[PDB]
């Protein structure tokens, strides 16, 4: 031997001392409460409440507003015979081309 080294320790099994162990801590009470807080907070709170919050987030992307505006524009344009989509985004009168 070249050192005064400890031998490699044996692997410790949590089920030996605590057959109904959740694998969080060696202490049974702390292990049980760690399982309880993780499950409750994570699953219940985060998953369920965040999912319903995201589901019912207000339509700030203006999808339905854009649909209503498009409906009004289509109705007005096809009622008056105008093209449904104007070929230019900006006004050629307001655009000044070089000579």
């Amino acid at each position: 031997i070249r050192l005064q080294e400890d031998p490699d320790p044996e692997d410790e099994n949590l089920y030996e001392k605590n057959p109904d162990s959740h694998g969080y801590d060696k202490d049974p009470i702390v292990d049980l409460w760690n399982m309880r807080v993780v499950f409750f907070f994570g699953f219940s709170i985060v998953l369920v409440l965040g999912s319903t919050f995201v589901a019912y987030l207000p339509d700030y992307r203006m999808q339905e507003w854009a649909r209503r505006e498009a409906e009004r524009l289509v109705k007005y344009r096809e009622a008056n015979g105008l093209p449904l989509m104007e070929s230019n985004c900006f006004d050629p009168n307001k655009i000044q081309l070089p000579e």
Binding site: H22, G23, Y24, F43
Partner: protein, 459 residues
């Protein structure tokens, strides 16, 4: 963003003042609460971003990454508490402090509004990761892995710093809004070519790009479980976010300078999938799968079309979740048998059924299985690449075939077959491990249910 930044800086003293047996409980509970608070950033506008103040802003691209980071912190806490049972109280608190500092730096990086602050923070993320790897790694190669990771990132990113200060001197501002509104075309000159190279190469090394990726297998194999989870889930997404941010000022030079990177990305995607086909180590297989997916993201960003950006963002989120779940499963297998060899342990389906179910789900999400967000992102990228050119479909099909091949090869080798006779220390799966897998997999399916939240600003 202060309502999310300050709770992390309060996580730090809480962890350092908590009892010796309550550190994990307190950290997990309050990390979950912070994630729930950060879920409120997903309410974005369709016109512009959320400008909180002069320093921080949130966008449709920044919000999913912030939510992913905040959700990822407690999972890393669970895995770390798995593998650090015998550590001393001070060292446990130091590990939790490193994780908290990494999360804080990542949040500030994603919310930063200037390119220089973004650079400072995304370089500051190196120190906690390097310390974690080189201090709590298991094998000898952790030191070499840390050196490779550090020097690859820094050699990539220093020219980015020089180019950023040059751009500020030239134009007047590094603010993202100003450089977006006041953008001017980048003429075809050698100086512009080298500026483009500096920025793109920094973020490509961060991606990583094929040929500049060996640090990724070295670090991911040799890092502890928390380091492996954070490195693949989030730290690989800094390059993609940066490239999606800086490409505003690099046009139209990107049309001419993207060919070598596109060829590298496609061919290296094929090559890394082939490498996955012949891997004797599970963590290495997962690492090279990560490289292939990030190469696909690089292709999407380089082709740079509105359909490619949405696919890139969706694929980044999906890959983060999937790679984190795969690393967790491999870590449980390793803790069972104390070795990373793939063929050492077999029959884990007849020895551990629920873990076999988790493996099946993770491998199904790893390959593009509809209607998962993985498939959504991959399909958008494939469509954009098809519009770009019509042989990219050949390359993408080859990659998909090899991806399915190696994913199912890993699943069959680890789970199916007959159990190894001499391995009799495989105890039943823990409630902690099962909860970890469930919390990895359920958000992915919920994001599949609601997909517009991870498609970025181009949606």
């Amino acid at each position: 963003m202060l309502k999310i930044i300050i709770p992390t800086t309060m996580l730090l003293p809480m962890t350092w003042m908590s009892k010796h047996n309550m550190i994990w409980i307190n950290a997990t509970v309050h990390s979950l609460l912070i994630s729930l608070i950060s879920l409120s950033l997903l309410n974005q506008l369709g016109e512009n971003s959320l400008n909180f103040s002069l320093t921080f802003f949130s966008d449709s691209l920044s919000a999913p990454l912030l939510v992913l980071t905040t959700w990822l912190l407690p999972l890393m806490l669970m895995a770390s508490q798995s593998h650090l049972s015998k550590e001393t109280t001070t060292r446990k608190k130091l590990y939790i402090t490193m994780l908290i500092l990494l999360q804080l730096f990542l949040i500030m990086t994603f919310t930063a509004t200037e390119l220089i602050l973004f650079y400072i923070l995304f370089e500051a993320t190196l120190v906690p990761t390097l310390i974690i790897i080189t201090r709590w790694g298991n094998q000898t190669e952790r030191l070499n892995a840390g050196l490779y990771f550090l020097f690859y990132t820094l050699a990539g990113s220093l020219p980015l710093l020089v180019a950023l200060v040059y751009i500020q001197n030239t134009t007047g501002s590094l603010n993202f809004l100003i450089i977006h509104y006041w953008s001017h075309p980048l003429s075809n000159s050698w100086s512009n070519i080298f500026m483009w190279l500096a920025c793109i190469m920094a973020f490509m090394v961060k991606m990583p790009l094929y040929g500049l990726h060996l640090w990724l297998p070295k670090a991911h194999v040799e890092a502890p479980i928390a380091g492996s989870m954070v490195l693949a889930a989030v730290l690989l997404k800094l390059g993609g976010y940066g490239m999606m941010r800086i490409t505003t000022i690099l046009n139209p030079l990107t049309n001419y300078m993207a060919y070598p990177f596109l060829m590298l990305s496609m061919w290296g995607m094929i090559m890394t999938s082939s490498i996955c086909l012949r891997q004797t180590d599970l963590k290495s297989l997962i690492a090279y799968s990560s490289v292939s997916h990030m190469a696909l993201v690089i292709v999407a960003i380089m082709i740079q079309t509105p359909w490619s950006f949405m696919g890139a963002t969706a694929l980044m989120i999906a890959h983060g979740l999937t790679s984190s779940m795969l690393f967790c499963l491999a870590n449980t297998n390793y803790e069972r048998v104390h070795s990373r060899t793939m063929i050492l342990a077999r029959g884990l389906q007849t020895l551990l059924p629920l873990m076999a179910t988790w493996w099946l789900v993770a491998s199904l999400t790893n390959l593009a299985l509809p209607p998962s967000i993985n498939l959504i992102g991959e399909l958008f990228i494939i469509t954009a690449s098809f519009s770009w050119s019509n042989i990219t479909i050949i390359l993408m099909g080859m990659n998909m075939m090899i991806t399915a091949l190696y994913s199912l090869y890993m699943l069959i080798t680890t789970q199916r077959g007959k159990y190894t006779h001499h391995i009799n220390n495989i105890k039943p799966s823990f409630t902690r491990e099962n909860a970890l897998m469930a919390l990895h997999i359920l958000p992915l399916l919920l994001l599949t249910l609601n997909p517009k939240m991870i498609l970025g600003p181009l949606y």
